[PDB]
């Protein structure tokens, strides 16, 4: 029943403003960390994202508390999740480390104040220039993804006379088929010879094995099975090769709740429901590692969990229309109420390209019943630019009183939402605002200007 | 049979270098307009796109020749397809007009030398500032997408005391449901009152009606049926309102061949096969318009057809690995040869997000049989960043002699491929090179630098 769907969604709405650590209401408006989001969107041009340093801190606390049973745990935020410098700074100030996924990500982590010993550099394509930059900066780990890349690591560490610290990425076949569907890592069967080669290299230091299971993983079993494979091989290689590993790096993949009404959801069928918590991830990993060693360092690489819940996208309702389907005799078959916001898939890419659900509310009318079925469209000149991941099918719920000028909020908009923006239609990539630990706001990324649209081009004026 | 697939693909390869108006071979390498693309990729850092001014000109000729039966045809390149200034300049110098999809697109079209009377501004969200800029610049057309937007056009044109020239966009119900699936335009039922209202406005001039059917449309029927609706309503409104329309704007959607072996394809099932040519589009449109008037101006808005065939993405094979699935006795079930190029979906977005096929060849070994099944991966730290739209399933064909350092070419890479790039993983958006009419090359867009990417951020140190 759609009445039951509407009732349930309004129960969720009420829970945002009465039972959510991030949110409040004031003057009829949604507030984030005490900041009125309607008011904030009158001071900065929409669309823009607003991040919460308090919520990032809460997320990091969940992750670290989860690993209390293993003292020697090192946490590296996967910076491909969000690398706006002010977000990286909040993460650095919250006391964890950083994982980087390109030369420029390494450089920005160093610039914002992560030390070399707080940085892991991962990748399937690490060109000589990338490896030379990483090795020269004394990174804590550079993963080894292939035998071809390892030849460059050997040659460049020799040229620099500088030790490269490495972890060998192994991707276990844990039942998709690994050889067909996992481009990353080496096969389990190649780990021994790879480690053998590294031991003999004068400037390459083997620190352990590495894996990464995936993203938004709704079950603990894959982490447990894959960690066991890497643990069993670590234990075996210690005996065969006569070494003691510094660490094991188990990657990321802790899910974030994108739908909260867990009683109504099956995470295995709809992974917008978070199937597990950080504690479940930690229990699975730590249990497997401790079957081998309790003293070894465990490295983790959470991305999504650090920032996903910690931002809201604010976008203004900028136009409206009613479209009507008529039958062949001119009688109404249905009306569709379209609301157009100033953010489309060029601003919130995963809503379109990855069928990602985010809660949508009228932030200007947050205490009003969301009692009208509407379709929510973006501003791109593209028939596919509307939000298909609705409350019911492709339909959302907003107050029937919704007006052009109101501010719509997408919740849980903090992971994989900034660097994935485009200038399609030459609409600018968005500004980003930060709410600090004191509840004060500041701009941390400007909106792309016109001069930004053309400065990259070379043309006679 | 896969031998037949391999034989067919190699026949296609031979037709590229011995049959295609764009390409030749020299020194074993793919040439585009006589430019050796292996050599070019040693002069500019990969990945980058190279555009051909000669091929843009050929595409425009096809479009304009198709409309020979209707002298008063005005052609507007849909600049959301590609708005790199050097590409826009080639299109301007080839003698056609420009359609724009945001305030900044209007501005860049004016900057590069399109006059106001050569610019159409379309959109579903045209905010007051957008409309004021457009009206102040005397645009040939601003479409009217909604009644709400029309109120701003009336108020702003009055404020400026400048006539706004408009076309009313009407989206016909041509049989899944226009009201549910088409966010753009007014309903046919609203056209009459909307036009009557415009006639009464002192600073708004009604030019005609507008539609746009869609993109990569593989049949002529949707264009004929939709044009007839617009033509019938135009003729009816001329009588009812006592006016003579300047024009009718029938939009874009002429497809481009992404697979060429039409004898093996069903365009209605796989629209990488172009189901129609520009001549088919023009026949359908012109036939319907001439049932009303032969003197009226027909406006068309081709995007994809102007540039799609006119660029190649050049990307270097930057790593390689073999993965093997073993049975439980250690015997080999299969091997997978992974080749990694330095372009992934952040560079060629539609290959991932829209399941778009592009021909892939080894440009460095273009005269060699492409006789080895490989999987082609990008450099992003994302298991999904590999090219799934293969020659057979997810598998591509390259010479068994392929080596790291070879240059891979993606053909037909000129539509919707530049502005859709991202800085995911902080890999830079690509440079762009142009081959001019004289066959000489120049950089027309730089690769994003480290600076460029961090300079939008506001941070302490
Ligand atoms: C990132 N995970 C990648 C990319 C996920 C999809 C992004 N649109 C994957 O292979 O799934 C990644 C992480 C962080 O993962 P989270 O899911 O915790 O954010 C950690 N380590 C590595 C090596 C990654 O690539
Ligand atoms: C463009 N309309 C889009 C094109 C597809 C975008 C895919 N990322 C659609 O969804 O139909 C457009 C054009 C040009 O269309 P082409 O297919 O010829 O490039 C012309 N007129 C208008 C009003 C458009 O929006
Ligand atoms: Cl840590
Ligand atoms: Cl023209
Ligand atoms: Na606004
Ligand atoms: Na060594
Ligand atoms: Na290169
Ligand atoms: Na008028």
Q: What is the 3-state secondary structure (H, E, C) of A278-300?
A: HHHHHHHHHHHHHCCCCCCEEEE
- Token pair for residue B211? 């539609």
Q: CB neighbours (10 Å) of residue A263?
A: 6
Write out chain B residues lying below 8 Å of A181, CB-based: 383
Estimate to the nearest angstrom the gap between the alpha carbon of A246 and the chain centroid: 28
- State the structure-solving technique: X-ray
Question: Do the beta carbons of residue B130 and residue B149 sit within 8 Å?
Answer: no
The CA distances from residue A188 to A34, A178, B323, in Å, are 50, 11, 10
Taking the C-alpha atoms of residue B129 and residue B123, their distance in angstroms, rounded to an integer, is 13
Which residue has the least CA distance to atom 11 on ligand 2?
A: B214
* Cβ–Cβ contact B450 with A under 8 A: yes
Q: CB neighbours (10 Å) of residue A221?
A: 12
Question: Do the beta carbons of residue A77 and residue A303 sit within 8 Å?
Answer: yes
- Which residues of A are the active-site residues? 381
Pairing verdict, β A332-341 and A311-326: antiparallel
Residues annotated within a binding site of A for pyridoxal 5'-phosphate? 253, 301-304, 416
Q: What is the dihedral of CA A14, A19, A20, A24, to 10 degrees?
A: 70
Residue count (chain A): 461
Contacts of A190 (CB under 8 A, 6+ apart): A147, A170
Residue of B nearest to A187 (CA): B323
- Cβ of B210 closer than 6 Å to ligand 2, yes or no, is no
Can you say whether residue A329 is alpha, beta or left, with left for phi > 0 and alpha for psi between -120 and 50 degrees? Answer: alpha
Residue burial A12-22, b: 16+ Cβ < 10 Å; e: rest: bbeebbeeeeb
Which has the closest alpha carbon to A57: A445, A438, A350? Answer: A438
* Cβ–Cβ contact B385 with A under 8 A: yes
Is B182 within 8 Å of A383 when comparing Cβ atoms?
Answer: yes
Using omega within 30 degrees of 0 as the cis cutoff, is the peptide bond preceding B47 cis? yes
- Cβ of B218 closer than 6 Å to ligand 2, yes or no, is no
Which has the closest alpha carbon to A247: A211, A209, A212? Answer: A209
DSSP per-residue string spanning A99-126: EESSHHHHHHHHHHT--GGGEEE--S--
Estimate to the nearest angstrom the gap between the alpha carbon of A262 and the chain centroid: 21
The CA distances from residue A95 to A56, A110, A118, A414, B355, in Å, are 11, 15, 10, 19, 41
In angstroms, how far is the first alpha carbon of chain A from the final one? Answer: 61
Which has the closest alpha carbon to A396: A360, A344, A369? Answer: A360
Which has the closest alpha carbon to B125: B107, B109, B148, B106? Answer: B148
Alpha-carbon torsion A91, A92, A98, A103, what sign? Answer: positive
Taking the C-alpha atoms of residue A80 and residue A419, their distance in angstroms, rounded to an integer, is 8
Which has the closest alpha carbon to B207: B117, B146, B124? Answer: B117
Block residue for tokens 């959801």: A265
B107, B426, B429: residue with CB nearest A83: B426
Resolution in A: 1.4
Ligand number with the minimum distance to the CA of B298: 4
Taking the C-alpha atoms of residue B52 and residue B50, their distance in angstroms, rounded to an integer, is 7
Using omega within 30 degrees of 0 as the cis cutoff, is the peptide bond preceding A47 cis? yes
Q: CB neighbours (10 Å) of residue B243?
A: 14
A102, A179, A338: residue with CB nearest B183: A338
Which has the closest alpha carbon to B361: B350, B352, B369? Answer: B369
Question: Do the beta carbons of residue B36 and residue B29 sit within 8 Å?
Answer: yes
* Cβ–Cβ contact B44 with A under 8 A: no
Mutate one of A426, A441, A446, A450 to test the B interface: name it (highest B CB count within 10 A).
Answer: A426
Taking the C-alpha atoms of residue A449 and residue A429, their distance in angstroms, rounded to an integer, is 9
Ligand number with the minimum distance to the CA of A317: 5
Which residue has the least CA distance to atom 9 on ligand 1?
A: B382
Residue of B nearest to A177 (CA): B325
Residue count (chain B): 461
Q: CB neighbours (10 Å) of residue B333?
A: 10
Taking the C-alpha atoms of residue B352 and residue A353, their distance in angstroms, rounded to an integer, is 9
Pairing verdict, β B73-78 and B297-300: parallel
Q: Is A216 exposed, middle or buried (0-12, 13-18, 19+ CB in 10 A)?
A: buried
Question: Do the beta carbons of residue A143 and residue A163 sit within 8 Å?
Answer: no
For chain A, the maximum distance between any two Cα atoms, rounded to a whole number of angstroms, is 85
- Token pair for residue B309? 């065939």
* Cβ–Cβ contact A151 with B under 8 A: no
Beta bridge partners of A300: A75
Which has the closest alpha carbon to B361: B309, B318, B418, B402? Answer: B402
- Which residues of B are the active-site residues? 381
Pairing verdict, β A311-326 and A297-300: unpaired
Element containing residue A410 per DSSP (H, E): strand A407-410
Which residue has the least CA distance to atom 5 on ligand 2?
A: B215
Taking the C-alpha atoms of residue A289 and residue A155, their distance in angstroms, rounded to an integer, is 33
- Cβ of A255 closer than 6 Å to ligand 1, yes or no, is no
Question: Do the beta carbons of residue B286 and residue B70 sit within 8 Å?
Answer: yes
Residue of B nearest to A321 (CA): B146
DSSP per-residue string spanning A22-67: TEEEETTEEEETTEEHHHHHHHSPSSEEEEEHHHHHHHHHHHHHHT
Contacts of B419 (CB under 8 A, 6+ apart): A422, A423, A424, A425, A426, B80, B82, B83
- Token pair for residue B119? 């610019």
* Cβ–Cβ contact B392 with A under 8 A: no
Taking the C-alpha atoms of residue B116 and residue B112, their distance in angstroms, rounded to an integer, is 12
CATH for A53-306? Answer: 3.20.20.10
3-state secondary structure of A169: strand
Q: Which atom of ligand 2 is nearest to the CA of B255?
A: 17
Taking the C-alpha atoms of residue B343 and residue B380, their distance in angstroms, rounded to an integer, is 8
For chain B, the maximum distance between any two Cα atoms, rounded to a whole number of angstroms, is 85
Question: Do the beta carbons of residue A445 and residue B458 sit within 8 Å?
Answer: yes
Crossing angle for the helix pair A85-93 and A53-66, to the nearest 10 degrees = 50
* Cβ–Cβ contact B117 with A under 8 A: no
The CA distances from residue B133 to A157, A404, B156, B162, in Å, are 57, 21, 10, 11
- Cβ of A383 closer than 6 Å to ligand 2, yes or no, is yes
Q: CB neighbours (10 Å) of residue B440?
A: 11
Please determine, looking at this structure, whether the domain spanning B52-308 carries the CATH number 3.40.50.720.
no
Residue A310 DSSP class: G
Question: Do the beta carbons of residue B284 and residue B227 sit within 8 Å?
Answer: yes
Question: Do the beta carbons of residue A84 and residue A445 sit within 8 Å?
Answer: yes
Taking the C-alpha atoms of residue A411 and residue A16, their distance in angstroms, rounded to an integer, is 10
| Dihedrals phi, psi of A417, to nearest 5 degrees | -110, -10
Element containing residue A312 per DSSP (H, E): strand A311-326
Q: Which atom of ligand 1 is nearest to the CA of A304?
A: 19
Which has the closest alpha carbon to A157: A97, A113, A197, A98? Answer: A197
Residue A460 DSSP class: -
Alpha-carbon torsion B402, B405, B407, B408, what sign? Answer: positive
Taking the C-alpha atoms of residue B257 and residue B268, their distance in angstroms, rounded to an integer, is 13
Block residue for tokens 């890497």: A230
Residue by residue, what is the 3-state secondary structure of chain B? CHHHHHHHHHHHHHHHHCCCCCEEEECCEEEECCEEHHHHHHHCCCCEEEEEHHHHHHHHHHHHHHCCCCCCEEEEEEHHHCCCHHHHHHHHHCCCEEEECCHHHHHHHHHHCCCHHHEEECCCCCCHHHHHHHHHCCCCEEEECCHHHHHHHHHHHHHHCCCEEEEEEECCCCCCCHHHHCCCCECHHHHHHHHHHHHHCCCEEEEEEECCCCCCCCCCHHHHHHHHHHHHHHHHHHHHHCCCCCEEECCCCCCCCCCCCHHHCCCCCCCCCCCCCHHHHHHHHHHHHHCCCCCCEEEECCCHHHHHHHEEEEEEEEEEEEEEEECCCCCEEEEEEEEEECCCCCCCCHHHHCCCCCCEEEHHHCCCCCCEEEEEECCCCCCCCECCCCCECCEEEECCCCCCCCEEEECCCCCCCCCCCCCHHHCCCCEEEEECCCCCEEEEECCCCHHHHHCCECCCC
């Amino acid at each position: 029943m759609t009445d039951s769907i509407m009732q349930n969604y309004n129960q969720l709405r009420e829970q945002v403003i009465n039972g959510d650590r991030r949110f409040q209401h004031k003057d009829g408006h949604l507030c984030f960390e005490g900041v009125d989001l309607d008011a904030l969107a009158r001071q900065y041009p929409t669309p823009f994202y607003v991040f919460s340093e308090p919520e990032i801190i809460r997320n990091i606390h969940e992750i670290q508390q989860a690993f209390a049973a293993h003292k020697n745990t090192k946490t590296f935020f996967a910076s491909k999740t969000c690398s706006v410098m002010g977000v990286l700074k909040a993460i650095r100030d919250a006391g964890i480390c950083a994982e980087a996924n390109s030369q420029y990500e390494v450089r920005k982590c160093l610039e914002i104040g992560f030390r070399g010993d707080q940085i892991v550099f991962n990748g399937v394509v690490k060109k000589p220039a990338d490896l030379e930059y990483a090795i020269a900066n004394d990174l804590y780990l550079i993963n080894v993804d292939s035998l071809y890349e390892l030849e460059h690591i050997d040659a460049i560490s020799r040229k620099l006379k500088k030790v490269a610290n490495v972890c060998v990425r192994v991707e276990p076949n844990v039942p998709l088929v690994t050889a067909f569907h996992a481009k990353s890592g080496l096969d389990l069967e190649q780990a021994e010879e790879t480690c053998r080669r590294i031991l003999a290299m004068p400037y390459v230091h083997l620190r352990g094995l590495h894996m990464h299971v995936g993203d938004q993983v709704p079950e603990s079993e894959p982490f447990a099975k894959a960690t066991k494979v890497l643990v069993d091989e670590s234990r075996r290689l210690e005996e065969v090769l006569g070494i003691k590993f510094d660490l094991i790096n188990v990657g990321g993949g802790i899910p974030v709740p994108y739908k909260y009404d867990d009683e109504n959801g099956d995470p295995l069928k709809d992974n917008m429901y978070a199937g597990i918590t950080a504690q479940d991830f930690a229990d699975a990993v730590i249990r497997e590692v401790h079957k081998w060693r309790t003293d070894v360092e465990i490295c983790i690489e959470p991305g999504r969990k650090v920032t996903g819940s910690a931002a809201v996208l604010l976008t203004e309702v900028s136009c409206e229309k009613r479209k009507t389907n008529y039958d062949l005799n001119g009688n109404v078959e249905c009306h569709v109420e379209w609301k157009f916001v100033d953010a489309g898939y060029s601003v919130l890419s995963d809503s379109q390209h990855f069928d990602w659900f985010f809660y949508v509310y009228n932030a200007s009318r947050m205490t009003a019943a969301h009692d009208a079925w509407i379709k929510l469209a973006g501003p791109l000149c593209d028939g596919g630019d509307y939000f298909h991941m609705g409350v019911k099918g492709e339909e959302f719920l907003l107050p029937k009183e919704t007006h052009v000028g109101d501010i719509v909020a997408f919740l849980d908009a903090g992971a994989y939402t900034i660097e994935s923006q485009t200038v399609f239609n030459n609409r600018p990539r968005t500004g980003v605002v930060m709410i600090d630990k004191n509840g004060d706001t500041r701009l941390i990324r400007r909106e792309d200007s016109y001069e930004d649209m053309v400065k990259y081009d070379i043309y006679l004026a």
